[PDB]
């Protein structure tokens, strides 16, 4: 069982995820409690007025999903809500907030209420990101640093004493972490940090490339662009160990690759990958969907042998690269190596529950559990 075990397990949970078709719908009760030592519920956002609020008021509330997540409590797992999220980050309003003192303190009690009114053991902070606003640096205030990690003093201060969780989603990208996270602080008053070690490559980069590298490549035109790099920076900052627990993705980035008849990584692109019948996002593709068209549509699988990064996959103009549960297992040895915190999910619904593809139900996230389970490094 995970919550006798050494290491956390934060699983995040998406409300969005209800409104797919077929066996891609998700509800709460999909949740399997044996699977995770936290969950984590995504996501509420900050209102006009300046205080956490519903984002989806059909689903949190008129159909109780707050409550049925908070369900899991009774299971042992820790269930905290997240405030955020890539989305409700894209304007000024985070920054405004955490530079006025005032808005700030407003917040803070209205936000351990919200809490405690729908029985959240804790606040999970998602803002994409202080100063670099959706990874754009030159959008905020550097004072962003110093109002966030006020913000999560003042936080951590009302929480605490209540028993109260809180944690905070982190970028994997060193330019961020320099210009937005005051580390020290951070690493000191949150409970975790789940760093969001993937999204590393996408359609954005123009050229094909792993959603989430473990080690470096020789052909990546950073040395710093994936996970060891990143969660050794986060160390080398002043993260204790015990505090990190390393992000791992249940879905792949998708490419329209140019007609040059090549199929290797970092070869040009058009285009995000054509959207998936269940997740319908250009540039994104659940695991669930990735494997389907392994199995049963004639892609080709690379992977590498030396296991520095997942497999890609690849038919026609159409190019995705993700995690299978080989890769997942090296990751989670690399989590036990250097004694994090544990290992993180984004997301619940994008790993294959339903067994679509027969490797078994939640294939990556049992991959997960059973090598944090198993003592051998
Ligand atoms: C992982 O990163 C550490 C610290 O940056 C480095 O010493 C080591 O070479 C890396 N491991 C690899 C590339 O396998």
């Given at each position: 069982s995970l919550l006798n075990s050494r290491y956390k397990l934060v699983c995040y949970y998406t409300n969005w995820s209800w409104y797919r078709p077929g066996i891609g719908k998700y509800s709460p009760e999909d949740i399997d409690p044996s699977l995770c030592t936290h969950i984590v519920y995504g996501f509420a956002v900050l209102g006009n007025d300046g205080l956490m609020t519903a984002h989806d008021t059909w689903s949190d509330y008129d159909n109780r999903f707050y409550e049925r997540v908070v369900e899991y409590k009774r299971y042992g797992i820790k269930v905290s809500l997240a405030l955020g999220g890539w989305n409700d980050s894209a304007g000024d309003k985070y920054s405004k907030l955490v530079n006025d003192p005032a808005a700030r303190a407003k917040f803070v009690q209205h936000a351990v209420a919200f809490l405690e009114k729908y029985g959240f053991d804790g606040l999970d902070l998602d803002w994409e990101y202080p100063k670099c606003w959706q990874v754009d640096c030159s959008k905020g205030p550097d004072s962003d640093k110093q109002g966030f990690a006020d913000l999560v003093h003042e936080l951590s201060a009302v929480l605490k004493p209540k028993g109260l969780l809180l944690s905070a989603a982190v970028s994997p990208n060193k330019?961020?972490?320099?210009?937005?996270?005051?580390?020290?602080?951070?690493?000191?008053?949150?409970?975790?940090?789940?760093?969001?070690?993937?999204?590393?490559?996408?359609?954005?980069?123009?050229?094909?490339?792993?959603?989430?590298?473990?080690?470096?490549?020789?052909?990546?035109?950073?040395?710093?662009?994936?996970?060891?790099?990143?969660?050794?920076?986060?160390?080398?900052?002043?993260?204790?160990?015990?505090?990190?627990?390393?992000?791992?993705?249940?879905?792949?980035?998708?490419?329209?690759?140019?007609?040059?008849?090549?199929?290797?990584?970092?070869?040009?692109?058009?285009?995000?990958?054509?959207?998936?019948?269940?997740?319908?996002?250009?540039?994104?593709?659940?695991?669930?969907?990735?494997?389907?068209?392994?199995?049963?549509?004639?892609?080709?699988?690379?992977?590498?042998?030396?296991?520095?990064?997942?497999?890609?996959?690849?038919?026609?103009?159409?190019?995705?690269?993700?995690?299978?549960?080989?890769?997942?297992?090296?990751?989670?040895?690399?989590?036990?190596?250097?004694?994090?915190?544990?290992?993180?999910?984004?997301?619940?619904?994008?790993?294959?529950?339903?067994?679509?593809?027969?490797?078994?139900?939640?294939?990556?996230?049992?991959?997960?559990?059973?090598?944090?389970?198993?003592?051998?490094?």
């Open positions: 330019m961020v972490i320099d210009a937005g996270y005051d580390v020290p602080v951070l690493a000191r008053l949150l409970d975790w940090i789940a760093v969001m070690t993937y999204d590393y490559h996408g359609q954005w980069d123009k050229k094909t490339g792993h959603v989430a590298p473990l080690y470096y490549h020789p052909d990546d035109d950073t040395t710093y662009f994936n996970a060891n790099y990143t969660i050794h920076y986060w160390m080398e900052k002043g993260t204790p160990a015990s505090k990190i627990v390393m992000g791992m993705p249940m879905y792949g980035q998708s490419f329209t690759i140019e007609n040059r008849g090549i199929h290797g990584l970092n070869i040009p692109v058009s285009d995000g990958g054509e959207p998936g019948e269940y997740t319908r996002a250009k540039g994104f593709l659940a695991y669930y969907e990735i494997c389907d068209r392994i199995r049963n549509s004639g892609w080709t699988v690379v992977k590498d042998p030396y296991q520095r990064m997942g497999p890609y996959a690849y038919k026609g103009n159409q190019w995705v690269s993700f995690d299978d549960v080989e890769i997942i297992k090296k990751k989670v040895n690399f989590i036990k190596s250097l004694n994090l915190g544990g290992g993180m999910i984004w997301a619940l619904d994008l790993d294959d529950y339903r067994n679509r593809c027969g490797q078994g139900k939640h294939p990556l996230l049992n991959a997960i559990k059973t090598e944090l389970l198993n003592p051998k490094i």
